[model samples]
Target chain A: DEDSLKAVRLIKFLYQSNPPPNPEGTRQARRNRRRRWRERQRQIHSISERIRSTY
Target chain B: DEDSLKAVRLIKFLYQSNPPPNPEGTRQARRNRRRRWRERQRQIHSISERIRSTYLGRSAEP
Candidate 1:
């Protein structure tokens, strides 16, 4: 959950704040962010759960 | 897909690195790196499989 593996994933899940200069481009980017958020949440949750279970 | 997502994740996944790193973090780093590598491989495999299957008319979505 807190390894470098996870740190990289953490940045992906939460660190993206700035958007493209183009608002139109931002639309697709926003959608991508949302989808990735879901995947990131799933990955993080699963990884954390696995770590918790192991220890 | 998450184009920028994995890039940042890559940094985090590899971020435990220091120029003059500690042996402990470095050791654990191998373990961590291996684990994540396996995971990423699995994800890629599954994703590719899904795309293949869907592309071949096995499924409607890709």
Candidate 2:
């Protein structure tokens, strides 16, 4: 029930049940995921931005 | 080597090495493993169980 998927990098992606890329439809799901990803990136950017902004 | 210890379905003990079924001392050592003993039992299905739970610990040195 377990095997580290680290060897291959192309056809193989580590971590079980890896979320698949946007399919044909499911615009809503894609939108939601993108929004979440953007929000996460923004959060990280501001965190470091603030430090840089201060300097 | 296996006389008195005959038909006596012996209990797992420490100093002895087997394993004492519900002994008094170090009884806690008898780790009641909550594991899927038959990894290949019944159906053959794969799951994304934890890494350590998968094969790390088992492969690691005792």
Candidate 3:
């Protein structure tokens, strides 16, 4: 029950922080954007998968 | 069990990305930096608390 509760809280936090947009003007922004996108997607998948299977 | 592992991984990530320095230049950067610090600190506390209560002698060793 604690795991389930923590999982839900973390999921809620992640869901609320919508991934920042890919800034168009700078090279660094583009690079960071890709990394952020991948990180966001991977975390969502990982958390959702475990939450469903465990809780 | 799975929850425990996920908890560790998330904790590690949070630890690795040290909170960004508060930028004093712009209203937007200052606001965003403030947000980042708050979020990171809250998460670190929440995850660590769950981890202790869920494992570490409080319950099963998942």
Candidate 4:
């Protein structure tokens, strides 16, 4: 079980394998940008709604 | 010398410290984008000049 515990310590590094977003100006780049924009808009809208309800 | 060799091996990791670019659509983001465009342009120009100079730089060789 000692070796298994060591393996557990190593598992976090195993998932550090996400590739960065694709290079600029491709279809993949546009998709990534739009997804980010929608996420940002959701956060902004939520804050706006919260502040409106406060008064 | 062993410690010095280990130090050299460690130096490469020290410079893995570039900050990611700023968030989109701000003035800071526009400046960052323009800087990147200029750098890419310089690289293209450098390669173009090398090609031109190879045929034109030193008239004494080959």
Which residue pairs in candidate 3 collide? Answer: none
Best-to-worst lDDT order: 3, 1, 4, 2
iRMS of candidate 2, Å: 22.9
Give the per-residue Cα lDDT of candidate 2 at B23: 34
**Could you give candidate 2's fraction of true interface contacts?**
0.00
Give lDDT tens digits, candidate 1, residues A1-55.
Answer: 4464555444344324222334345778978877765664564444445434433
Worst 10 residues of 1 chain B by lDDT: B13-22
Please give me the DockQ of candidate 1 compared with the native complex. 0.10
Minimum summed lDDT over a 10-residue window in model 4 chain B is located at B9-18
lDDT of 2 at A20: 36
Residues B1-62, candidate 3: write the lDDT tens digits. Answer: 65566555555544444446656978988898788667656655655554555544445555
Q: Which candidate comes out best when scored by TM-score?
A: 3
Each candidate: chain B TM-score = 0.48, 0.13, 0.51, 0.47
Which clashing pairs does model 4 show? none
Rate residue A2 of model 4 by lDDT: 75
Tell me the lDDT of model 4 at A23: 52
Error in Å for residue A5 of model 1? 28
What tens-digit string does per-residue lDDT give for candidate 4 at A6-27?
3333222212212234557979
Q: Residues B1-62, candidate 1: write the lDDT tens digits.
A: 45444443433333222122233567779787667657755544443343334333344554
Identify the runs in model 3 with alpha carbons over 4 angstroms from their true place. A1-55, B1-13, B22-24, B57-62
